[PDB]
Write a protein that binds this ligand. Structure first.
Ligand SMILES: *[C@@H](CC(=O)OCC)[C@H](C[C@@H]1CCNC1=O)NC(=O)[C@H](Cc1ccc(F)cc1)NC(=O)[C@H](N)Cc1ccc(F)cc1
Ligand SMILES: CCOC(=O)CC[C@H](C[C@@H]1CCNC1=O)NC(=O)[C@H](Cc1ccc(F)cc1)NC(=O)[C@H](N)Cc1ccc(F)cc1
Lengths: 305, 305
């Protein structure tokens, strides 16, 4: 029993992390087979910030202008190209530690592990959710760009996020590994704002199931509601509408606990309207929305990789 | 910016995990050089567990009663002994992935990462604190025994915990890698319970510093206090007493924020006596006590490994 913010084991990703330096600028890159992937803003200077002419900047660069190091050991760059907001540096050595991998684009509300890195060296690993406004609430400092997010699906590492920037509100934005931003963001320093964020309802419900599995059941009554009536309340509290597809995804947890999904919804409706009356759930005094239904199953059933 | 429950990168430990089977019983072991470490109750049957005579059970067993597997690779056992509550199995091949390592006994209040494993295969990584009552609030299922806790210092892995059991209250108890239990617990299935727990004051203070670094400042008040006065309030609220060495360990965070430690104590005093009043700190409505001062520095300064 117990329930923690648990990330995927990071070893497979640690062996891919390198440092990329262009001029005065160093960030992290992902080294897979004979290609290193990193944010293309490594080739910028401050004159470039509002209107970087990336094609011009790259044309002026030769392979020797990129210093790639793997554990402080130089790798020779032999080719360079750009895909969307990611730079692809072909190196003359293939990474012998490349895991089976795929590049995926995740959906809002889904989670992933982030391996936070500085100068090609990992600092720590933590779990993030893609927020409905396409930011993440990460933990990133100067030097962290090029850090990646990933899930492990079987023995395949599915990379889904590469870190580019922090908004003034303290939240984070980045791309998939093909260089396409999540959300309405660009890698030009215009003033950019995220939409208002909402709470990920399906994840809150999954976390309430996690609490029940762990014996933390005080908020359960033999109440039930309809999907429409639940949604009428949810939207008053800035929660995403719950769809029948979401109800379906909660099946496995409903099956384990014997608590119908619309009964759990009636419990959540009561918590929103009446509060928690000083009580905690799974050690939290707030309703948590960064565990997916799969996260709860994975953790409450012991899946390995 | 940002602040997350961050674990250490787990790669160095992943390469050390193996599966140990004795008859029908399988759990995890730690393979370092040519020794595999695991909990000694692997040699039991649930009939033994009232009063297991481990010395009898171990002397009767031969090396071939022990099946050790690194992935699919069988490691031949050439010796078996006991050290306190940990079995040591000498194998004929040294782990080629053995990192630089030490065995440490951690103190109450200190944190570590846990790599939760099943059948020798890593499932996830998360951060834990050693509670003042020598339990941890982990996340462990059947099959997880022999999972380890660790910290990393440079390139040295400091193993500090090996998992053995769950108390009926849902908390977890285990040993260091010399096989000595944390707290008063024993590896026999007798009624056992942990002392009442308390809150880790120095960690709460470190987390309040993390909040200021991150721009949460509302709870700062103009007052100061003394250690003696503050410790009177600490005991009222079941907080550990603060020592001068704790104050000194907070120095790096006081240095970065310019908030003196005894002014932060005054702020915490008022939080304890008036609550948060529907405000949050770092996205929590409770005072969090599972980040050490070094955890906050590591995370808010970008220390890597
Ligand atoms: C790990 C054992 C394992 O993996 O072997 C494979 C068969 C397992 C970890 C717990 C399972 C659920 N959550 C856990 O953290 N440990 C046990 O199952 C442990 C076995 C044991 C029995 C007696 C003893 F003295 C030490 C270990 N049994 C328990 O955790 C349960 N709860 C019984 C128990 C044991 C000791 C106590 F003080 C109180 C309850
Ligand atoms: C120099 C070495 O290379 C890095 O390692 C840098 C990574 C670091 C991670 C940050 C650092 C603090 N914590 C984070 O997470 N990234 C940055 O500094 C970005 C760089 C960058 C400018 C322009 C743009 F288009 C894309 C990206 N600059 C901002 O983030 C600033 N906030 C300015 C800003 C504000 C809103 C917005 F939409 C875009 C840029």
């Amino acid at each position: 029993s117990g329930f923690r913010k648990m990330a995927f084991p990071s070893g497979k990703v640690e062996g891919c992390m390198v440092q990329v330096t262009c001029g005065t600028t160093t960030l992290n890159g992902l080294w897979l087979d004979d290609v290193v992937y990193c944010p293309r803003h490594v080739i910028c200077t401050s004159e470039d910030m509002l209107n970087p002419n990336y094609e011009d900047l790259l044309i002026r660069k030769s392979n020797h202008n990129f210093l790639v190091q793997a554990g402080n050991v130089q790798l020779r760059v032999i080719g360079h190209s750009m895909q969307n907001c990611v730079l692809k540096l072909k190196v003359d050595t293939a990474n012998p530690k490349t895991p089976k991998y795929k590049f995926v684009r995740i959906q809002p509300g889904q989670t992933f592990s982030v391996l936070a890195c500085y100068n090609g060296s990992p600092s720590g690993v933590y779990q993030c959710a893609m927020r409905p406004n396409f930011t993440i609430k990460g933990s990133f400092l100067n030097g962290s760009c090029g850090s990646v997010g990933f899930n492990i699906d079987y023995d395949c590492v599915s990379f889904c996020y590469m870190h580019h920037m922090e908004l003034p509100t303290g939240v984070h934005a980045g791309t998939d590994l093909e260089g396409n931003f999540y959300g309405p963001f660009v890698d030009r320093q215009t003033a950019q704002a995220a939409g208002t964020d909402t709470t990920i309802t399906v994840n809150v419900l999954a976390w309430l199931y996690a609490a029940v599995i762990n014996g933390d059941r005080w908020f359960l009554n033999r109440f039930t509601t309809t999907l429409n009536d639940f949604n009428l309340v949810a939207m008053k509290y800035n929660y995403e509408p719950l769809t029948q597809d979401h109800v379906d995804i909660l099946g496995p947890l409903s099956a384990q606990t014997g608590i119908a999904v619309l009964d759990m919804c009636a419990s959540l409706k009561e918590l929103l309207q009446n509060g928690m009356n000083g009580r905690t759930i799974l050690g939290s005094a707030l309703l948590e929305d960064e565990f997916t239904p799969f996260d709860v199953v994975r953790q409450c059933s012991g899946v390995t990789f």
